[PDB]
Design an enzyme around this catalytic site. Structure first.
Site, PDB file in Angstrom:
ATOM      1  N   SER A  62       0.814  -1.242   0.000  1.00 31.99           N
ATOM      2  CA  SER A  62       0.000   0.000   0.000  1.00 31.99           C
ATOM      3  C   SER A  62       0.842   1.285   0.000  1.00 31.99           C
ATOM      4  CB  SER A  62      -0.972  -0.001   1.144  1.00 31.99           C
ATOM      5  OG  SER A  62      -1.849  -1.102   0.991  1.00 31.99           O
ATOM      6  N   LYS A  65      -0.006   3.389  -2.942  1.00 29.29           N
ATOM      7  CA  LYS A  65      -1.112   4.365  -2.981  1.00 29.29           C
ATOM      8  C   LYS A  65      -0.538   5.785  -3.067  1.00 29.29           C
ATOM      9  CE  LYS A  65      -4.463   1.402  -0.578  1.00 29.29           C
ATOM     10  NZ  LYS A  65      -3.712   0.133  -0.733  1.00 29.29           N
ATOM     11  N   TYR A 149     -10.886   2.153   5.209  1.00 26.99           N
ATOM     12  CA  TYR A 149      -9.680   1.968   4.370  1.00 26.99           C
ATOM     13  C   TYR A 149      -9.953   0.903   3.302  1.00 26.99           C
ATOM     14  CZ  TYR A 149      -4.732   1.222   3.218  1.00 26.99           C
ATOM     15  OH  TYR A 149      -3.539   1.104   2.573  1.00 26.99           O
ATOM     16  N   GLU A 271      -0.679   9.917   4.975  1.00 29.47           N
ATOM     17  CA  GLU A 271      -1.373  10.117   6.263  1.00 29.47           C
ATOM     18  C   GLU A 271      -0.434  10.891   7.179  1.00 29.47           C
ATOM     19  OE1 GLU A 271      -2.829   6.260   7.567  1.00 29.47           O
ATOM     20  OE2 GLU A 271      -3.533   5.805   5.526  1.00 29.47           O
ATOM     21  N   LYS A 314       3.290   6.330   5.371  1.00 28.09           N
ATOM     22  CA  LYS A 314       2.409   5.282   4.816  1.00 28.09           C
ATOM     23  C   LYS A 314       3.023   3.913   5.086  1.00 28.09           C
ATOM     24  CE  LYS A 314      -1.321   3.905   2.773  1.00 28.09           C
ATOM     25  NZ  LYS A 314      -1.308   2.687   3.633  1.00 28.09           N
ATOM     26  N   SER A 317       1.929  -3.388   2.813  1.00 29.38           N
ATOM     27  CA  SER A 317       2.142  -4.823   3.030  1.00 29.38           C
ATOM     28  C   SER A 317       1.658  -5.612   1.832  1.00 29.38           C
ATOM     29  CB  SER A 317       1.464  -5.267   4.290  1.00 29.38           C
ATOM     30  OG  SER A 317       1.973  -4.575   5.405  1.00 29.38           O
TER      31      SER A 317
END
Ligand SMILES: *[B]([O])([O])[C]([C]N1[C]=C(C([O])=O)N=N1)[N]C(=O)[C]C1=[C][C]=[C]S1
Length: 360
Positions: A62, A65, A149, A271, A314, A317
């Protein structure tokens, strides 16, 4: 002495967490006041004894992203889409579906109304099955109210951003995004000539695990990169002004917060947290409940710049790998931690916090 002290700091953070979580191989890359530092540990493959280096390729899951968010940032910079667009504007197949009432911002920030963590197992990597999944989907709750999420959520965001630019997502990433960012060791589809660098991933009983195909895999979790290339991406994020202007704007678009959940402010991909903040609070923001449960958002009256006294991060996995990226804009500090085991987020943050605290 400085080189001895930094190595002692990084070793003290990394070595016990690698033993405790039986991590075969782990790469650290640090950007400190414009200088890169690399620390490589253990094995990319246990079976052949191949060592981790800063050029070893890891699945970053991720963390992909943040690359997806950067491509959407480019479409925004070129005025090909707006975050307040209805999702169905950019894909006629979705006309007349619930995506008529859902914004691109809702998709990007996981507030479309209950799109789940993963596509259901019934949806294979197939254009028609993905199309039909979104055509039939109905929200559990009002768009823009709850964060859940979700790969189908931000995956569709990336898919629609690519459609706004008139080319497939994977093509735009390979042909335009990675070259604009100076990334030649960053892949959605690892070339045959680079396969010798691709680390093995390890799960239960050390079962070997490299990521298999899935719906919108490229958008959600598809990137394989080295610690050195992912630190180049962090350095681009720390200094967007060094890139050609459309790409500087693309990166700035990923540094804007739209709402808060607990201590976390949600951007496109990234984030953010106030810095300093306790280790326990940084772990809690990256917790399993944050990833798996819906949370009511606190919407900001205007987008908030994710800069200055903040940590942007961030986790990512796959079944075989565990990655973490964090940077502090107002300190010109960046960190990458890539491993070939999916070890707990709390433990990734433990390493990062020890290093970032010791550089500060
Ligand atoms: B991304 O890393 O957030 C995403 C979902 N995910 C997994 C985890 C974890 O295991 O802690 N947290 N969040 N990653 C993926 O969907 C890629 C995967 C491929 C196979 C298993 S997860």
């Amino acid at each position: 002495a400085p080189a001895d002290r930094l190595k002692a700091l990084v070793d003290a953070a990394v070595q016990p967490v690698m033993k405790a979580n039986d991590i075969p191989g782990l790469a650290v890359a640090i950007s400190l006041k414009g200088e890169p530092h690399y620390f490589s540990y253990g094995l990319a493959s246990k079976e052949d004894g191949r060592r981790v280096t800063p050029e070893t390729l890891f699945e970053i899951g991720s963390v992909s992203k943040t690359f997806t968010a950067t491509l959407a940032g480019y479409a925004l910079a070129q005025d090909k889409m707006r975050l307040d667009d209805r999702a169905s504007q950019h894909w006629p197949a979705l006309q007349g579906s619930r995506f008529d009432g859902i914004s691109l911002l809702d998709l990007a920030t996981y507030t479309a109304g209950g799109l789940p963590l993963q596509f259901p197992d019934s949806v294979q990597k197939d254009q028609a099955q993905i199309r039909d999944y979104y055509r039939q989907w109905q929200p559990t709750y009002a768009p823009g109210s709850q964060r859940l999420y979700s790969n189908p959520s931000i995956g569709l965001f990336g898919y629609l951003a690519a459609r706004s630019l008139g080319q497939p997502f994977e093509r735009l990433m390979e042909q335009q995004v990675f070259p604009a960012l100076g990334l030649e060791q960053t892949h959605l589809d690892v070339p045959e000539a680079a396969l010798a660098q691709y680390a093995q991933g390890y799960g239960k009983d050390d079962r070997p695990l490299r990521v298999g195909p899935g719906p919108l895999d490229a958008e959600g979790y598809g990137v394989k990169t080295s610690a050195a290339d992912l630190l180049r991406f962090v350095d681009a994020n720390l200094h967007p002004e060094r890139l050609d202007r459309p790409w500087a704007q693309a990166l700035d678009a990923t540094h804007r917060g739209y709402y808060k959940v607990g201590d976390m402010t949600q951007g496109l991909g990234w984030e953010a947290y106030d810095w300093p903040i306790s280790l326990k609070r940084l772990q809690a923001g990256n917790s399993t409940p944050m990833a798996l449960q819906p949370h009511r958002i606190a919407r900001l009256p205007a987008p908030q710049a994710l800069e200055g006294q903040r940590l942007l991060n961030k986790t990512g996995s796959t079944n075989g790998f565990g990655a973490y990226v964090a940077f502090v804009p107002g300190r010109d500090l960046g960190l990458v931690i890539l491993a070939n085991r999916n070890y707990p987020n709390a433990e990734r943050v433990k390493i990062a916090y020890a290093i970032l605290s010791g550089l500060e």
